[PDB]
Design a protein around this ligand. Structure first.
Ligand SMILES: CNCC[C@H](Oc1cccc2ccccc12)c1cccs1
Ligand SMILES: CCCCCCCCO[C@@H]1O[C@H](CO)[C@@H](O)[C@H](O)[C@H]1O
Ligand SMILES: CCCCCCCCO[C@@H]1O[C@H](CO)[C@@H](O)[C@H](O)[C@H]1O
Ligand SMILES: CCCCCCCCO[C@@H]1O[C@H](CO)[C@@H](O)[C@H](O)[C@H]1O
Ligand code: NA
Ligand code: NA
Length: 504
């Protein structure tokens, strides 16, 4: 079995997975909407009671499986729980990242496309008033994606958007096909320092921004001024637990698979904690210092609330580009912003497609070359649904990217700490540890962490599922049909894997 060559590469690869577009866009918006500086109280608590415990568990499960030559959850769950239902539940841990890949790599391709257009100056140039500046960029984005102008749920992406998607798939393949140490690990040691340099440059440049409407200082103010009255709202604690869960990328299978290339007795306690820490720093320090402070500096604190409510996507793909076209040398600034997002996405997508690569390698005994090419083939083909069918992206993001992962996160906890055995699980986590997990976490992992996730899942199921089922367009069944099919297809692959094993 392949192994991470160095401790540094392992940590940077894991952190690279966690550090994504959300760090620079989602987190700052969530913080502004849920109490500003006060948001850090439930955020740190969620980190302590949910994020860190689960992450250690996923590392442990992965390393445990890797020791027996298995990197994915259908086989790993079966090792922890010799039951047929464990294998089927394990399929979900292969389905979720596959479905996410089918839309996320496409979104990743947008950032590359925008970076190129900015670099060569193929961007709009307004003109006055905010709407006079934003609209040309809203249209620019919509023409890139091909947002429906009529009543049909049909997208019509530009030729450029389609070709950039191909190139983005090629870049992902180039890394993955070289493997863990020579591919993913090698790239992490280049990409993370590059990510850090781009962000710091952006932070510095943003802190120098001054407009008649305000300054960057105003932005940092609005974002970090605490509003403790929002702490009463249970949804703010839900938002924190949710933010933490997604920011660490728990429940996606990627962490377990990466850990399966960690040697049997190599530390995971300190390494895992370190990776999580980098993500948190990149999140609150770098992410919180760029997008929102820039927006408030240009439009004024008067529009701070409106900007925050417009969402993470509008902020990163419409608002900031518009601002950059109004600032000195902003065109090169725009390139750097989208270059930053692209590497943040790329380090996440190579991690997210590895579980499917690992499964074909470990369980169906495919060569790395074949496993990478077939995985890319499926993601590329399937993505045409996301490229041409409106709201298909959203449907996939909901079932797999939202409900699925929280459900799967809870499933990991229960199977590991309750079915497999908390004592066996506890020793599995701490073995080879540079530091030992605090004794208190035994109770957290067993009762607190699953309680939190159960609450999150129930609240989100009751809130969003009735809406999605009753108020959506009929074309959502096309996407539902397709991803249910993918789950059946994977169940079949798992079936062939156990049949092959019975023969040999
Ligand atoms: C915390 N960072 C990981 C982000 C995660 O990334 C992935 C998680 C799981 C599978 C993936 C497959 C391809 C690309 C990215 C993948 C997500 C992406 C979109 C929504 S959540
Ligand atoms: C069966 C063959 C169909 C190939 C599907 C890929 C077609 C390439 O689709 C491209 O993407 C966009 C379509 O919205 C626009 O870029 C272009 O007009 C088209 O070239
Ligand atoms: C092959 C595609 C056929 C699917 C059409 C079945 C009818 C779908 O019907 C629609 O389903 C939506 C999504 O659940 C609901 O939001 C709508 O209210 C409902 O009218
Ligand atoms: C690709 C095949 C898709 C299968 C279609 C699913 C049928 C959904 O049947 C249901 O009809 C209900 C009547 O109220 C509607 O509210 C919704 O359309 C749907 O949930
Ligand atoms: Na993150
Ligand atoms: Na990343």
């Amino acid at each position: 079995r392949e192994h991470w060559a160095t401790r540094l590469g392992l940590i940077l690869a894991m952190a690279g997975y966690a550090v994504d577009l959300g760090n620079f866009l989602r987190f700052p918006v969530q913080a502004a909407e849920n109490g500003g500086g006060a948001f850090m109280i439930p955020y740190i608590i969620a980190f302590l009671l949910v994020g860190i415990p689960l992450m250690w568990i996923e590392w442990a499960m992965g390393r445990y499986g890797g020791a027996q030559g298995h990197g994915t959850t259908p086989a790993i769950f079966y090792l922890l729980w010799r039951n047929r239902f464990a294998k089927i539940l394990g399929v979900f841990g292969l389905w979720i990242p596959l479905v996410v890949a089918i839309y996320y790599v496409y979104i990743e391709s947008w950032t590359l496309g925008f970076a190129i257009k900015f670099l060569v100056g193929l961007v709009p140039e307004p003109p006055t008033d905010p709407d006079s500046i934003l609209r040309p960029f809203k249209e620019f984005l919509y023409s890139y994606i091909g947002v429906p102008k009529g009543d049909e749920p049909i997208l019509k992406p530009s030729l450029f958007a389609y070709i950039v998607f191909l190139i983005t798939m090629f870049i992902n393949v180039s890394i993955l096909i070289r493997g863990i140490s020579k591919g993913i690990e090698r790239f992490a040691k280049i990409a993370m320092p590059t990510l850090f340099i781009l962000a710091v440059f952006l932070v510095i440049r943003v802190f120098l921004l001054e407009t008649p409407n305000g300054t960057a200082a105003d932005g940092l103010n609005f974002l970090w001024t605490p509003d403790f009255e929002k702490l009463k709202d249970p949804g703010v604690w839900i938002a924190a637990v949710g933010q933490i869960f997604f920011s660490l990328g728990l429940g996606f299978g990627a962490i377990i698979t990466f850990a399966s290339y960690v040697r049997k007795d190599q530390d995971i306690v300190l390494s895992g904690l370190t990776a999580a820490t980098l993500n948190e720093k990149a999140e609150v320090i770098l992410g919180g210092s760029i997008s929102i402070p820039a927006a408030v500096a240009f439009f004024g604190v008067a529009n701070a609330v409106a900007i925050a409510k417009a969402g993470a996507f509008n902020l990163g793909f419409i608002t900031l580009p518009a601002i950059f076209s109004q600032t000195a040398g902003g065109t090169f600034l725009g390139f750097l912003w989208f270059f930053l997002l692209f590497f943040a996405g790329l380090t996440s997508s190579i991690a997210g497609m590895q579980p499917m690569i690992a499964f074909l390698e470990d369980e169906l005994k495919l060569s790395r070359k074949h496993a990478v090419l077939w995985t890319a083939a499926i993601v590329f083909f399937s993505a045409h649904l996301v490229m041409f069918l409106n709201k298909s992206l959203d449907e996939m993001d909901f079932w797999a990217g939202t409900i699925g992962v929280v459900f799967f996160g809870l499933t990991e906890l229960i199977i590991f700490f309750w079915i497999f055995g908390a004592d066996k699980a506890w020793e599995e986590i701490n073995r080879g540890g540079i530091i030992k997990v605090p004794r208190i976490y035994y109770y957290v992992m067993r009762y607190i962490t699953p309680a939190f996730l159960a609450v999150l899942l129930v609240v989100w199921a009751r809130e969003y599922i009735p809406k999605i089922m009753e108020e959506t367009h009929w074309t959502v069944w096309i996407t539902r049909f397709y991803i249910i099919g993918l789950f059946l297809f994977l169940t079949f692959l798992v079936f062939l894997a156990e049949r092959r094993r019975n023969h040999e």
